[PDB]
Write a protein that binds this ligand. Sequence first.
Ligand code: ZN
Lengths: 146, 54, 46, 49
Amino acid sequence: IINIKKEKRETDEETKQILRMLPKDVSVAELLRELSLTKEEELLFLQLPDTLPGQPPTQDIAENACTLADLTEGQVGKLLIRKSGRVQLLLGKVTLDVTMGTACSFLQELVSVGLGDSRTGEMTVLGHVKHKLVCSPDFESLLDHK
Amino acid sequence: MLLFCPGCGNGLIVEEGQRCHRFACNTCPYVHNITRKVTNRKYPKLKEVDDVLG
Amino acid sequence: DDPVVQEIDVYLAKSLAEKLYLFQYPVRPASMTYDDIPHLSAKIKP
Amino acid sequence: DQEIVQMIGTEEHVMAAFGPSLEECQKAQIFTQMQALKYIGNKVRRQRM
Ligand SMILES: [Zn+2]
């Protein structure tokens, strides 16, 4: 029997129903093992808030939503890992917090669909997505500030 | 247990082919022959030995 | 609780802003991938 | 059906309880959205013409 086409168990984390013979991680330890334990690159999928703490630069406006489509390239923020497991994102004057998202177990392929021509385009499989991050405003600090 | 076809995701039933018993889906030609023993225990709750009252 | 280690920088790229899509298979576990499956075509609408 | 089972739950007792429903669905030839919609429409009665 082919080993890469066996039947799959309902539990996606325990699909190994037949053999030839997971604790919930944290973002700080995640990045630590991603950089210290190994050096291989990893593709992440983080969810940013609706409005970023910035203004659309010369985008013809209004206090509207400021997303990544309005920001330019270059360094836009820093990622801080404090003690006791705190993972913050300093995006300027304010600091958001980064937590682990829903632990997806199904296949997630990050691909690039580039329509170079109006008749023929190219689909480029960039990689696989395994972990999901969630960035949230530190509302407590924003409230105790003013 | 409950098994599903990797192709379309429908439930797999157990049938008999020309060589051996196999899991098969009713909506695709996907099959899977059984090589070794497969078991699914349930461990039902044992009738607790009731005690005399009074 | 000071930021002792891992002061990672965050960069932004706009090269694939309009060409980046996310495809997720709710019925296919992450263990088995479609890398070995030969694809034939993809229909799409802008 | 795998997506339906994942939506219902991944617990062993959940699958054991939901098994009969999947079996009864597989007894009929309902496997697509069109077939299920036709089966539902067959069970629909007009609001008195
Ligand atoms: Zn199938």
